[PDB]
């Protein structure tokens, strides 16, 4: 039978990161839960830190509900994102409504591969008046790289996400890149992205994000288990401004099971 | 019925100082006693955070009737269709979205029936030509290279100095050919001579067509056999009216 | 008898520098050889480093051949620079031809002193179409400073090279400044420059290179032997960008004999 | 007519944190399709001063009628005289002063005609016995080891836990045997089974004879084939009334 | 014909080292010269540094003269060391006399290998009254290590000099270890040691010097050329005092030709 929705072959995808501080370090946890059919059912964010001599844990939950050709994603703040899905279970449009009654509308378009798996090529954000406010386009033409174009109001930026030829890592982890959920407007759809509602992740892990040039490259180093599934990602941001280099590192631990 | 390399191993080692911390890269090509490439191991050594990292990936090469099947650890299967002389005429592999990517190859056939790559064309799943590289051998001391990637076009000349030509007894390809897209996707097939024979003389300069050119100069060290032990690559660059050259040093173990 | 060519009273001028690295430091050697008549006959570049546990030395040689009113300089890559000399042996024009058949043309003009020694005042580079692509002009009007104007395509920059009044060091070493062979297009003629084919070096050593102003000054400190001949040069580049100073140091050892 | 290893490669990798800067050590043993050891490559990676260092040395193993000749890059020739079953009975090599050093070996012969080393004796050029190691297999779960180096004598017991024995399908020797003088001089011959078969079960403890013993405990990780992927070695040590244990972690690639 | 003296197959063995300072660094050079027969003929020590802005070079020369069964070594200070040699050209005794008329006497004993090459096993120093003041003994029994016993008056210390099994480097450079000429009383005979008058160096390079235990290990890392001859030695001294480690590094460059 042909599939009617994208699936994740895991029951849980969990990310853990320490957000550094010389006074109050915070451990952030992002937990994505999938049902036995492989659809995302919910997301829980957690922040853990010490205050006085006591450990505190702050939680926020996002719910995912499915209807015929629809995914309804509701966060802790009461914002409802309604995704209209095609026959294959990928969103073609989204309407987001906050508790103040403000709305945002999005369209999505895809590359459809030989197996009928969909890969996001375009996210466009419109305003109430129908004015296009932002977009991200992804081009899969380069054999081992993704060409990314971003526009946020008057800001425009192009970048390339690369996989090393001869050193490719298969994305059997089925995870998105760390940078993708931080890019506006995809940053508004992180829960839909981990649920594959906005398309499949690339078939190989990305090891470099190169913005167009002052230069600011991101390098990703992965640790895998004996199944070839990601256990951690080391991200190194190298920012250069007229021969002055400042390096920032992130370590994200993964529990994919 | 097939091209051969008279060595059992071709290994490249390089310290890359370009990154925050220096990375050591190793590229090892292994050949069987018949002279056919059987495998490739790519290695990277560096530290990331507290963790010392050693990334090691192995690609296998299998030969069938008029075929070379190149399989990596990521599960990519690249199938090269070979002609009667053992050089690829076609290649199918899988892209970032899992679609089939097709490559065609055409050659210069010399008097000794040795094939030299003249054209690599890359076609997308819809049949659209995405990129090509053409090589003109009219003057062996000045190879005319045309590259087209999407809408962008780059022409360059690869030269050998008249009277100071070094015989390529090492049977190695130039450093620049495995960095030029789409040939940069076929480094394993290139070192296996599946995509043609390397230049008969070592190339000492890569000159782009002109602006004060960002030319690459190659300097080689040879052993007592006349086989390459190291290559120094200098890319000239002008920054605020001053020469600021980028350099690479690659050590070779050819045995 | 009046001289027909410039001369260097040494048989060898050799520069040695360590190009720093926390993994693969490289020792670079630049050797200029002069015949007993004092004309430059050749240049050898050498790079020495460790790979594994073995020392490697990479060499490149440039040849200098003389004919009536001509100097032909050929590098390791096969590029031929043909200098047309005046009656005093200084180049008035140069044509450079690479192995791909690309050509570059240059004109040179000079200050002629009371002893008929020539000091470079202008290098102009033209393109095939006759379009002026770059130039460097040197003014010797200030008693103890050189005023330098550089143009490379659309880039324009002015700088001053100074000698300290009361602390002058006679240039009996007959060497050019370190910065002169790094400035484009003089950087294309380093072998001709050390051979005095492009003029005499200034009579006193330069201790400061001050570009016009973000500021980026170079200071030179020399060590001499008991003959008053240079044995080393310490070059300190001080780059300032809105109160943020980054200092870069070079040590070049000289063997002038 | 000779012992065999059913793998083509046995590789050990270790990060040594004992030194000022961490050293990465690699020991690679290669076997031919017949199962005989053909060579060894020892590698060390570290930084010394500004220079990143990579020391790499290769030892070759050649077989002749009733002989195994082990040659290193330093020009040492170690000649092992083999019996009819392919195990060494004698060895001649060259010491620090260039004198011939002689070793004799004797074995336990099991029911399947497999040989297990019981004695290694080292003799100086004058014929003086300088050292020996004897191994008693009376109890396979508690091997009695006697070592004598000059005047100093050390007795220890190598144990396997009753009911929790791991089959040595990996065909690897213990980590401690190639550290025990004079067996520490014959690591290449040991991995080639030239000096006998390894223990049928992995050894989990090395207990010296007693004082609160400086015992070594080995913990192994196996893959789905039951072949070793890593070994963790813990040496217990008491310093000012506190436990201060020394640890080693060795990763294995047995294929 | 059987040899009557030890030989070095080089004409020069030269060591260069920078003795660090944040004010007046000194470059020290130790040059050992051998005649075409392979006997040491002389030693020159050189110290080079900057004072003011001038380079200064301080030199001291030691002469080596040979007679039947004798080597006479005279330094810059006028101290004469007379070595009595055996039939193979190795010293069995030495008498040293300074300009004040003070004398020191030494005996030497050796391991004689199958090729009749001699390796030092014992140096004993006596006083005028015949009282043994110091000794160094070297044992070659361990296949890949040297066991060293030292006694200087009431001070006694044992150490082990090791070669790594499976990673041996042949001593085709024919050089002694760096530590051997720093150990008293062998430190009084450095010129005789480089001339092989006090025996052959070990057949493999030493990579570690381990004193008996507070611990103080020396590690040696060598760089070789394509002939397998030493070009440099990196020596790292690791001193530990109750969990407090202080590391000292030396880099000695070699010119062996
Ligand atoms: Cl951009
Ligand atoms: Cl072009
Ligand atoms: Cl300006
Ligand atoms: Cl005991
Ligand atoms: Cl002691």
XYZ file of N, CA and C in Angstrom, chain E residues 159-237:
237
model
N 69.510 4.625 36.693
C 68.541 4.982 35.661
C 68.566 3.951 34.533
N 67.535 3.964 33.680
C 67.420 3.040 32.550
C 67.231 3.863 31.289
N 68.008 3.562 30.243
C 67.897 4.231 28.932
C 67.279 3.220 27.979
N 66.084 3.504 27.462
C 65.383 2.511 26.656
C 65.196 2.896 25.187
N 65.105 1.836 24.360
C 64.790 1.795 22.930
C 63.439 1.074 22.797
N 62.448 1.580 22.011
C 61.144 0.889 21.970
C 61.175 -0.350 21.074
N 60.799 -1.526 21.595
C 60.752 -2.750 20.794
C 59.655 -2.609 19.691
N 60.057 -2.811 18.436
C 59.188 -2.664 17.272
C 59.223 -1.292 16.630
N 59.880 -0.323 17.273
C 59.979 1.039 16.755
C 61.395 1.553 16.799
N 62.386 0.654 16.928
C 63.823 0.970 16.937
C 64.242 1.796 15.734
N 65.190 2.711 15.974
C 65.821 3.497 14.919
C 67.281 3.121 14.970
N 67.828 2.627 13.861
C 69.245 2.293 13.786
C 70.072 3.569 13.961
N 71.127 3.476 14.778
C 72.008 4.612 14.975
C 73.083 4.665 13.850
N 72.651 4.878 12.614
C 73.565 5.030 11.480
C 74.186 6.436 11.527
N 73.592 7.343 12.317
C 74.110 8.684 12.603
C 75.413 8.601 13.431
N 75.619 7.485 14.145
C 76.795 7.197 14.989
C 76.945 8.249 16.085
N 75.833 8.722 16.608
C 75.884 9.774 17.604
C 75.627 9.231 19.019
N 76.250 9.844 20.028
C 75.841 9.520 21.402
C 74.488 10.181 21.731
N 73.854 9.697 22.780
C 72.680 10.263 23.404
C 72.993 11.645 23.939
N 71.982 12.509 24.043
C 72.241 13.846 24.574
C 72.625 13.824 26.049
N 72.002 12.920 26.829
C 72.198 12.869 28.271
C 73.613 12.405 28.680
N 74.276 11.563 27.862
C 75.531 10.915 28.230
C 76.651 11.942 28.508
N 76.752 13.012 27.718
C 77.805 14.024 27.887
C 77.478 15.048 28.982
N 76.329 14.914 29.643
C 75.914 15.800 30.728
C 76.088 15.130 32.084
N 76.271 13.796 32.084
C 76.472 12.981 33.275
C 77.916 13.035 33.739
N 78.164 13.436 34.983
C 79.505 13.489 35.557
C 79.930 12.059 35.996
N 81.156 11.563 35.684
C 82.307 12.241 35.037
C 82.394 12.136 33.499
N 81.412 11.516 32.819
C 81.478 11.469 31.354
C 81.408 12.873 30.752
N 80.819 13.837 31.477
C 80.715 15.249 31.067
C 82.114 15.912 30.912
N 83.164 15.291 31.476
C 84.546 15.780 31.386
C 85.216 15.272 30.115
N 84.546 14.371 29.356
C 85.130 13.702 28.202
C 84.272 13.750 26.959
N 83.500 14.805 26.756
C 82.567 14.954 25.626
C 83.252 14.881 24.274
N 84.418 15.504 24.149
C 85.172 15.478 22.874
C 85.633 14.013 22.578
N 86.220 13.317 23.576
C 86.614 11.893 23.421
C 85.400 11.031 23.089
N 84.236 11.327 23.692
C 83.001 10.555 23.461
C 82.549 10.683 21.986
N 82.526 11.896 21.426
C 82.125 12.096 20.016
C 83.149 11.532 19.023
N 84.389 11.353 19.476
C 85.452 10.761 18.679
C 85.516 9.259 18.764
N 84.594 8.652 19.546
C 84.474 7.189 19.792
C 85.665 6.618 20.576
N 86.493 7.492 21.175
C 87.672 7.148 21.986
C 87.213 6.415 23.274
N 85.976 6.701 23.729
C 85.395 6.066 24.913
C 84.307 5.056 24.539
N 84.386 4.537 23.324
C 83.506 3.480 22.875
C 82.477 3.886 21.862
N 81.851 2.874 21.282
C 80.799 3.020 20.284
C 79.508 3.449 20.924
N 78.687 4.260 20.238
C 77.333 4.542 20.789
C 76.425 3.299 20.612
N 75.330 3.182 21.364
C 74.415 2.033 21.194
C 73.883 1.979 19.735
N 73.578 0.779 19.284
C 73.202 0.512 17.904
C 71.848 1.060 17.548
N 71.035 1.387 18.546
C 69.724 1.982 18.313
C 69.630 3.242 19.090
N 68.888 4.228 18.576
C 68.666 5.494 19.283
C 67.846 5.285 20.583
N 68.216 5.993 21.664
C 67.495 5.968 22.936
C 66.280 6.934 22.863
N 65.091 6.452 23.242
C 63.933 7.355 23.203
C 63.493 7.746 24.622
N 63.979 7.051 25.662
C 63.612 7.408 27.029
C 64.711 7.169 28.037
N 64.871 8.122 28.948
C 65.791 8.029 30.076
C 64.931 8.068 31.325
N 64.887 6.949 32.030
C 64.052 6.799 33.213
C 64.905 6.666 34.463
N 65.016 7.738 35.275
C 65.745 7.609 36.541
C 64.890 6.822 37.533
N 65.529 6.165 38.505
C 64.819 5.431 39.549
C 64.118 6.435 40.495
N 62.849 6.148 40.878
C 62.028 6.990 41.761
C 62.146 6.518 43.195
N 58.405 11.406 43.718
C 59.128 12.281 42.791
C 59.785 11.505 41.618
N 59.336 11.800 40.371
C 59.824 11.198 39.118
C 60.348 12.284 38.144
N 61.351 11.951 37.302
C 61.904 12.903 36.328
C 62.342 12.219 35.022
N 61.390 11.835 34.159
C 61.656 11.166 32.883
C 62.061 12.139 31.730
N 63.003 11.698 30.853
C 63.375 12.404 29.606
C 62.944 11.545 28.405
N 62.215 12.152 27.481
C 61.757 11.505 26.261
C 62.438 12.188 25.068
N 62.954 11.389 24.142
C 63.607 11.867 22.934
C 62.823 11.515 21.706
N 62.578 12.517 20.856
C 61.886 12.326 19.571
C 62.848 12.769 18.502
N 63.115 11.902 17.543
C 64.047 12.196 16.475
C 63.376 12.452 15.146
N 64.003 13.314 14.338
C 63.616 13.583 12.953
C 64.791 13.099 12.163
N 64.507 12.356 11.087
C 65.543 11.798 10.236
C 65.427 12.348 8.862
N 66.490 12.214 8.072
C 66.410 12.604 6.669
C 66.110 11.333 5.867
N 66.171 11.412 4.537
C 65.885 10.269 3.667
C 66.978 9.188 3.743
N 68.135 9.462 4.396
C 69.203 8.459 4.582
C 68.986 7.705 5.907
N 68.051 8.171 6.738
C 67.830 7.616 8.070
C 68.796 8.192 9.104
N 69.370 9.370 8.787
C 70.318 10.087 9.641
C 69.588 11.247 10.349
N 69.869 11.419 11.656
C 69.260 12.416 12.528
C 69.478 13.865 12.011
N 68.374 14.662 11.985
C 68.393 16.090 11.631
C 67.998 16.918 12.855
N 67.283 16.301 13.821
C 66.897 16.981 15.044
C 66.455 15.994 16.100
N 66.547 16.445 17.344
C 66.146 15.728 18.511
C 65.372 16.681 19.407
N 64.132 16.276 19.739
C 63.262 16.986 20.667
C 63.343 16.216 21.996
N 63.841 16.858 23.060
C 63.995 16.250 24.393
C 63.015 16.891 25.353
N 62.155 16.089 25.972
C 61.153 16.581 26.909
C 61.453 16.001 28.279
N 61.783 16.868 29.242
C 62.012 16.473 30.628
C 60.718 16.721 31.394
